[PDB]
């Protein structure tokens, strides 16, 4: 048994994108043309050195990498790549960007520099901030590469959580005003501020559905809602996130799949007197439940025993009823009512 994972695809493609400032609308980013979105030049703009491009995704996916591609503009000097696990609230940064290693601590924090030690470490790289390439500049943030977990992902919850997301945001804080226009720019001269802005011509986010290792394909069940995907769950899981077992399969607790075992849901046993059940840890630890083979190696509890039956596996007769010796536990007549005197 091993984990199953649906293919990666471009989360960008069918997402909602927005820009705090814009005048080349935002869409040009996520579409596939050579067109592009472009912020208002520092010229008639004071705080237009701080913009925010935002992508909203349907559900919550696992993001493998965010790739930005700049057009008529050099990469920015200071920006923040942020995600969201809410659908637009408690943001969190993924990585920080700065030209001067000192700028990091000055603008972000003292600790924002230590190398990656723990799967959910943030960081403040420089590399992607050297104005040098001032045209078609590409940045590739890989949320997985490096991290200690990438090795044995399956057993690294921190990473798995670090990579989830609902919204992804590009927070630009300061243009990469380099060369020697500093004085002009600082002074606010319309010969330097009219050649400084932001230009994205493509935002490509590689990610995939979340299925806890119980599915290798997830499509859209409804043609009318082409972007809401649902896992084609396996391992007897259910939920379209495969986060729960299916009716009838609760002998064991639910688990995501690891490299070692599929961890598929086991079927509880109700001697043909029930349609559903639930897992009770106490019962399992107490060894008081029959599995399919009739051994007490589980924790399944039948709900609504039918046929005047009752018990963890509906193996007994409700008090007041008696078991027909001429009948087997599965008979819909196992238990007969009290006879006349
Ligand atoms: C740019 O995006 C940032 C998100 O990083 C926004 O910052 C938030 O601004 C609100 C103002 O109501 C504050 O309450 C939040 O605390 C800010 N987030 C932070 C840094 O904690 C900002 O509003 C956006 N501005 C632009 C460019 O439109
Ligand atoms: C994954 O983690 C398990 C338990 O922590 C460990 O036995 C296994 O060797 C790890 N995978 C590898 C080889 O990195």
From Swiss-Prot:
Residues 209-267, 268-337 form the Laminin EGF-like domain. Glycans are attached at residues 52, 152, 287. Residues 1-208 form the Laminin N-terminal domain. Disulfide bonds join 209-218, 211-231, 233-242, 245-265, 268-277, 270-302, 305-314, 317-335. It is found in: Secreted, Extracellular space, Extracellular matrix, Basement membrane. In adult, high levels in heart, lung, and kidney; lower in brain, muscle and testis; very low in liver, gut and skin. Laminin is a complex glycoprotein, consisting of three different polypeptide chains (alpha, beta, gamma), which are bound to each other by disulfide bonds into a cross-shaped molecule comprising one long and three short arms with globules at each end. Alpha-5 is a subunit of laminin-10 (laminin-511), laminin-11 (laminin-521) and laminin-15 (laminin-523). Binding to cells via a high affinity receptor, laminin is thought to mediate the attachment, migration and organization of cells into tissues during embryonic development by interacting with other extracellular matrix components. Alpha-5 may be the major laminin alpha chain of adult epithelial and/or endothelial basal laminae. Plays a role in the regulation of skeletogenesis, through a mechanism that involves integrin-mediated signaling and PTK2B/PYK2. The alpha-helical domains I and II are thought to interact with other laminin chains to form a coiled coil structure. Domains VI, IV and G are globular. This is Laminin subunit alpha-5. It comes from Mus musculus. The chain holds residues 47 to 433 of 3718 of the full protein.
């Amino acid at each position: 048994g091993f984990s199953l994972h649906p293919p990666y695809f471009n989360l960008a493609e069918g997402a909602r994108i927005t820009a705090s400032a814009t005048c080349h609308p935002v869409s040009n980013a996520i579409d596939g043309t050579e067109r592009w979105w472009q912020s208002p030049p520092l010229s008639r703009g004071l705080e237009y050195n701080e913009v925010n491009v935002t992508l909203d995704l349907g559900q919550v996916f696992h993001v493998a990498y965010v790739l930005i591609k700049f057009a008529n503009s050099p990469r920015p000097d200071l920006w923040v790549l942020e995600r969201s696990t809410d659908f637009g609230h408690t943001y969190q940064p993924w990585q920080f960007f700065a030209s001067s290693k000192r700028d990091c601590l000055e603008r972000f924090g003292p600790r924002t520099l230590e190398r990656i030690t723990q799967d959910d470490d943030v960081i403040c790289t420089t590399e992607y901030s050297r104005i040098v390439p001032l045209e078609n500049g590409e940045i590739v943030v890989s949320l997985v590469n490096g991290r200690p977990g990438a090795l044995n992902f399956s057993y690294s919850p921190l990473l798995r959580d670090f990579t989830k997301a609902t919204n992804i945001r590009l927070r630009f804080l300061r243009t990469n005003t380099l060369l020697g226009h500093l004085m002009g720019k600082a002074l606010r001269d319309p010969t330097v501020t009219r050649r400084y802005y932001y230009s994205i011509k493509d935002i490509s986010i590689g990610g995939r559905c979340v299925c806890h290792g119980h599915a290798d394909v997830c499509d859209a069940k409804d043609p009318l809602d082409p972007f809401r995907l649902q896992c084609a769950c396996q391992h007897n899981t259910c939920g379209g996130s495969c986060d729960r077992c299916c009716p009838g399969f609760n002998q064991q607790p639910w688990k995501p799949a690891t490299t070692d075992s599929a961890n598929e849901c086991q079927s509880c046993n109700c001697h043909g007197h029930a349609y559903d059940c639930y897992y009770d840890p106490e019962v399992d630890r107490r060894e008081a439940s029959q599995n399919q083979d009739n051994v007490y190696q589980g924790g399944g509890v039948c709900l609504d025993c039918q046929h005047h039956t009752t018990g963890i596996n509906c193996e007994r007769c409700l008090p007041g009823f008696f078991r027909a010796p001429d009948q087997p536990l599965d008979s819909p007549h196992v238990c007969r009512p009290a006879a006349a005197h």
